[PDB]
């Protein structure tokens, strides 16, 4: 499963993920500024926290 690596706002990166066949995407705003992280599986959502789950190939972007 290929998705993508970059966060924040990094470059459009992707790599291939080993058994594990999901992907998430997790970002948050700050005082003057946003978060972004994404990688493989599918943490658990916390209040306060953005984040999504998929199964989707680069869904976490």
């Given at each position: 499963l290929e998705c993508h690596n970059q966060?924040?706002?990094?470059?459009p990166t992707t790599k291939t993920c080993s058994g594990e066949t999901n992907c998430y995407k997790k970002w948050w705003s700050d005082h003057r500024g946003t978060i972004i992280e994404r990688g493989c599986g599918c943490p658990k959502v916390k209040p306060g926290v953005n984040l999504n789950c998929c199964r989707t190939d680069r869904c976490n972007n």
């Amino acid at each position: 499963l290929e998705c993508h690596n970059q966060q924040s706002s990094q470059p459009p990166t992707t790599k291939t993920c080993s058994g594990e066949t999901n992907c998430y995407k997790k970002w948050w705003s700050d005082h003057r500024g946003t978060i972004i992280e994404r990688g493989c599986g599918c943490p658990k959502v916390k209040p306060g926290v953005n984040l999504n789950c998929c199964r989707t190939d680069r869904c976490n972007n």
